[PDB]
């Protein structure tokens, strides 16, 4: 009587179920894993926090209207201000981890719409003005809030076209990214595990993001008559196998 | 033969041969069968 | 191998081609698993699209240009083309940079090849015999400032001597500072507010000073490099969507504004042919 | 002292030639790899993946609206979309499939084309995809449609149908440029019943669509994409 | 092996020189069936009537120019030979032509020379010394505009650099579409009422780009260039009667009107020697 | 770096000479050959179909 | 010794020594011996 | 090679990082004696620092 | 004659290249070695003896 | 394959791999062990 539907996720002191899943995917069929010694290079013995770091936390809530655009978070930005996982970020030199991505959105069988949960490892975005201008650090930073695609262009901020992927490329072939979708009709929930993608075996945590979540309206919502026109969608994320490394005095960063 | 001490200067690879793309087509955690239903 | 097996009717409660894309999977589905086919053959191997392949044919990645002239009274030799640098980068000429973007990191050897031709645009007796000497000048040594600097001695640095109108060729070990040159990076240097983006920041290489080691005739002569480069012993992690906005600048993903709609537009319905 | 004889084709470079040459940077090592999930082999690892395919160009700028294909409820024998199967042009050219089919210049093999339905769950729809084989028209009608390769795709719990364009060829390799020798057929929907929406719900619904290639797939001799080019070279 | 053995009187009701022609086939007769020989050997194989060895030496099948000039003000480089194309076919020049025509359907691969030579046809103080880049570009690649475009990166597309007087050689494999490059076709590319007929329809194989990679000096050089085509790995079939009419089109079959009786007329009777 | 002379001959291009060469397209796969009837290898294989003669050749 | 890889590099091929002239020759049904009659 | 072995918390009455440089040497420390590493290979061979290699260009 | 063909990069002279060369002085006989205390093999041999930093810059 | 009879002509030498800090390092007269006390 399982079905690919029904799941549950344990990790530390928390808890998700979802009653209509579709599967879950692992990216790049790989699941999380600490750092072995043969690839290894800074000589200080990591801290792994185990279960105070390894839980689920829920970002605050967007709201999908028949006008959205799309949202971005950044990771481990996201997570900057998160219980004991945050300070620990500010307090080593150099970090690591994978997550589990829980997006949520449920509504009802008279609902359409459908969301692309997508996990892009390194989404250098552009600058809306063009030629080599920057994207200044803040606006790749924005923490839990993430960008929201139908937000201004702001300056020293990046491009939010959504056809463009924020880079140059069409939001039609995001699909080549490890991805799930939401279609109210079939799902409720996408989840997606990321193990640790990098060109280093460890790195820091404040100046370099190592994926961007991305969730995308791409049917648009279409609620049934007289319902109010929008649904909250709702993201938990999970650090995963976790590891700190360098401790010392506590970054400071920008704004 | 190679002429040269390096390996930087040997001539290219050799094809892979590797090949599997369910890396990319099919990173689910719960294995699908072609054939049984997509959700049970 | 067989590219299709033999396949006839099918009246089944197993029906293959009804799947839920929500999953993010692409099921592996066949003309024989909704057609009846016959058996085929492959009689092919894929052998062209290996990466190496891809990714292991010389493509032009530079052009510059030096001339041979009188330096007297020249404050600027940099500026006189007494000779020129190049700041090492792939994503300056759009052809490779498209083919390597296709992946987020990339690990090679580089193999390069650097032609040399001359011109006379105006009046000269003949085409003078020059020496071009292209220096590998790496991250924190001297800078080269006149044509002819104790930098040229290049007593530690590689250095490669041919002749305008001939070749040369040489090939560099890989040698990214981490375990694969990186094609993205959503980072910065440092956590400075101001800081640059990009990978502008990450993958430095260093110049390459070319200059030609003959002094001057009485004419002037122009010579333009070419310098083509071949990576060898390609590894690429993490395909990615390809470029479909022009580019504007080397090592950022920005594109041009007021750009063209870049799906072309039917000429009819969603219903013509 | 050996005696030597050089041919022709001394001295010249071939960009595509292979053979050794001397390190600039004697004895270096480089940097250990370490392990990254995600290496990619072979360009046909990845064609089969499957990505979105802007069936709806009909928009005058690039939107995600062309994206989807709208489905009206209560219209019977009537046509959802059609397109030819140039795959290295039109709607397929800046997929993922037919943008990696441009670096080559022949290509044979099946395809897979499938729709996912986004409808309400209380709605019902029966919809009829045909693929034609070169040598006819553009079906014209469904009694047209529905005599070349065709799967009644029944809309359902599955979201899901997945239609194969199976090799149908004389030549064993065509062209990725449109070319009319070597033209590979039309695809085409229809209703065979009809969209029926539940109570208390209205509109369009749309259908999304994908394009990735089968195990069956072959591209060969390698070429530059029409789609990139430059006037200067670029800075930092 | 012999060439023919010893053979003496007959006075048979076995007749091996009385046959019907009717029936399509040629009887192998010999001498020996019908007048006395003695035993002789061959003493030879038919080596350099092989296949192979008949379409397997170097033949001109192109010769195009292109000119190095200074571009500046001209609107149209392809019209002004900064460079040209060549839209590879073997059946321009006929000598060549009519040896593979011999057959119907011929596979090999080609090795191919190229000579380039220079002419300065009006005053130069000297020789400049050019090189040529012939880009191999094939059906549905961007097009050279200029002769400096993007096109010449070509990064993906094979291309070889050689200097004018010097010559290239390269080997391209058999790259015909069916199993067997077709030497005449009877169809179409469609059923359309008026598209094309013969085999231009067919065999597509794409240009080549040639141009000088050297900016201009001040005076003029004329490149001309001769491409040359040796089959190699040969296999041919179906034989067919030899061309006896000038050729008119490359890829039709069609001769000249009022063209000129092609068999000699006797200086004489049926009965003169 | 082994010493050579190189002899009289040396760059000339003889249509004739038959030698190996770099491929352009490295990697690339040929159709694969059907069966076809009719295969000629020697031309002194055709040379013994008879074909008529234009013997009265006085027009 | 071929000094490239792919097949196309190689020299000329080497003489067939097939020959084979009756499919051009004597293409004929049923087999016709010389010395009997042509036409029975 | 290993270029770090792995060391936990010292207590001791034996202390690596105390010296007397007057004497001349120059004692080989390394990071386990003053904090607690983890296991680490070198991946290296220092070819390109041998003389013959730093006078041979 | 063996046929041979010259590749890209031929005649030129990299710096970093290490090939054989004819000795000017043929079979000239050298000085024996006698033995010197000091030999170093690696720059890395002599990296980890300590020397004094001028910390105190202020001057 | 050396093409030259001296041993002048042959190329760049193999590395000595032999490394021995020591005689610059520690050139003491009587030895000294890490974590013994430098002066007894
Ligand atoms: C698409 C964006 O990616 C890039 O631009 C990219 C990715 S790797 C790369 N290299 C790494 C290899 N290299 C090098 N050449 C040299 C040439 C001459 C002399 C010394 C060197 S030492 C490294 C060229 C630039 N650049
Ligand atoms: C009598 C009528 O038959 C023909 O004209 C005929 C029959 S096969 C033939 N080829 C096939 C082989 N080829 C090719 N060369 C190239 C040269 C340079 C670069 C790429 C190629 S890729 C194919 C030349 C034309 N043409």
């Not at chain 4, 928009?59 to 989807?68: G, P, R």
Request: include cysteine.
């Amino acid at each position: 009587g399982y079905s690919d539907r029904v799941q549950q996720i344990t990790l530390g002191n928390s808890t998700i179920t979802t009653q209509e899943a579709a599967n879950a995917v692992v990216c790049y069929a790989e699941w999380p894993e600490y750092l072995p010694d043969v690839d290894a290079s800074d000589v200080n013995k990591t801290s792994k926090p185990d279960t105070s770091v390894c839980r689920f936390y829920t970002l605050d809530s967007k709201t999908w209207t028949t006008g959205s655009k799309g949202w971005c978070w950044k990771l481990p930005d996201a997570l900057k201000d998160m219980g004991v996982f945050g300070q620990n970020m500010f307090f080593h030199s150099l970090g690591r981890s994978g997550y589990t991505v829980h997006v949520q959105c449920n509504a009802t069988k008279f609902h359409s719409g459908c969301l692309l949960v997508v996990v892009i490892p390194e989404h250098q975005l552009a600058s809306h003005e063009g030629g080599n201008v920057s994207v200044k650090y803040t606006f790749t930073h924005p923490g839990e809030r993430g960008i929201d695609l139908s937000s201004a262009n702001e300056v020293g901020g990046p491009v939010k076209d959504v056809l463009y992927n924020m880079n140059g490329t069409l939001l039609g072939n995001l699909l080549i990214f490890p991805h799930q979708f939401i279609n109210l009709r079939t799902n409720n929930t996408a989840t997606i595990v990321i193990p640790y993608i990098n060109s280093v075996p460890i790195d820091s945590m404040t100046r370099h993001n190592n994926v961007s979540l991305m969730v995308i309206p791409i049917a648009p919502l279409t609620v049934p008559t007289g319902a109010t026109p929008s649904l909250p969608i709702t993201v938990t994320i999970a650090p995963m196998c976790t590891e700190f490394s360098g401790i010392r005095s506590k970054s400071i960063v920008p704004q | 033969i190679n002429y040269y001490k390096d390996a930087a200067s040997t001539s290219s690879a050799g094809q892979s041969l590797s090949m599997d793309p369910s890396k990319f087509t099919e990173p689910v955690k719960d294995l699908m069968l072609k054939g049984a239903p997509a959700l049970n | 191998t067989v590219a299709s097996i033999s396949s006839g009717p099918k009246h089944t409660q197993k029906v293959p081609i009804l799947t839920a894309n929500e999953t993010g999977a692409t099921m592996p589905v066949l003309p024989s698993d909704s057609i009846e086919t016959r058996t085929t053959y492959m009689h092919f191997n894929g052998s062209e699209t290996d990466v190496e392949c891809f990714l292991g044919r010389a493509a032009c990645v530079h052009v510059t240009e030096i001339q041979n002239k009188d330096a007297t009274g020249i404050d600027n030799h940099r500026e006189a083309k007494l000779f020129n640098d190049w700041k090492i980068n792939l994503s300056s000429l759009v052809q490779l940079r498209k083919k390597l973007e296709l992946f987020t990191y990339v690990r090679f050897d580089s193999e390069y090849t650097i032609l040399a031709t001359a011109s006379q645009p105006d009046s000269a007796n003949y085409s003078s015999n020059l020496v071009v000497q292209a220096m590998y000048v790496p991250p924190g040594a001297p800078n080269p400032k006149e044509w002819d600097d104790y930098t040229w001695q290049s007593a530690s640095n590689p250095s490669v001597f041919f002749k305008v109108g001939d070749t040369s060729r040489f090939s560099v070990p890989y040698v990214g500072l981490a375990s694969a040159y990186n094609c993205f990076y959503d980072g910065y240097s440092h956590d400075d507010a101001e800081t640059q983006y990009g990978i502008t920041v990450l993958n430095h290489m260093g110049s390459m000073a070319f200059r030609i080691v003959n002094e001057h005739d009485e004419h002037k002569t122009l010579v333009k490099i070419r310098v083509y480069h071949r990576a060898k012993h390609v590894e690429a992690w993490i395909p990615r969507a390809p470029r479909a906005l022009p580019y504007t600048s080397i090592g950022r993903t920005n594109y041009p504004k007021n750009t063209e709609p870049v799906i072309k537009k039917r000429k009819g319905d969603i219903k013509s042919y | 002292g050996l005696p030597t004889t050089t041919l022709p084709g001394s001295g010249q470079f071939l960009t595509t030639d292979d053979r050794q040459s001397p390190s600039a940077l004697p004895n270096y090592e480089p940097t250990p790899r370490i392990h990254i999930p995600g290496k990619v082999h072979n360009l046909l690892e990845i064609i089969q993946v499957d990505t979105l395919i802007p069936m709806n160009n009909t928009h005058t700028k690039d939107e995600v609206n062309s994206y989807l294909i709208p489905l009206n409820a209560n219209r019977q024998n009537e046509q959802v979309f059609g397109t030819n199967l140039f795959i290295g042009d039109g709607v397929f050219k800046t997929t993922l499939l037919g943008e990696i089919v441009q670096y080559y210049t022949h290509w044979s093999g099946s395809l897979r084309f499938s729709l996912m339905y986004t409808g309400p769950a209380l709605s019902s729809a029966k919809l009829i995809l045909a693929y034609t084989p070169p040598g006819a028209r553009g079906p014209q009608d469904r009694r047209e449609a529905m005599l070349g390769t065709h799967v009644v795709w029944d809309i359902g719990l599955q979201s899901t149908i997945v239609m194969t364009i199976p090799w149908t060829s004389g030549v064993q390799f065509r062209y990725t440029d449109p070319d009319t020798y070597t033209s590979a057929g039309f695809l085409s929907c229809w209703y065979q019943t009809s969209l029926i929406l539940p109570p208390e719900t209205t509109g369009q619904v749309y259908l999304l669509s994908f394009i990735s290639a089968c195990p069956d797939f072959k591209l060969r001799l390698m070429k530059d994409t029409q789609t990139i080019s430059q006037t200067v070279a670029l800075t930092e």
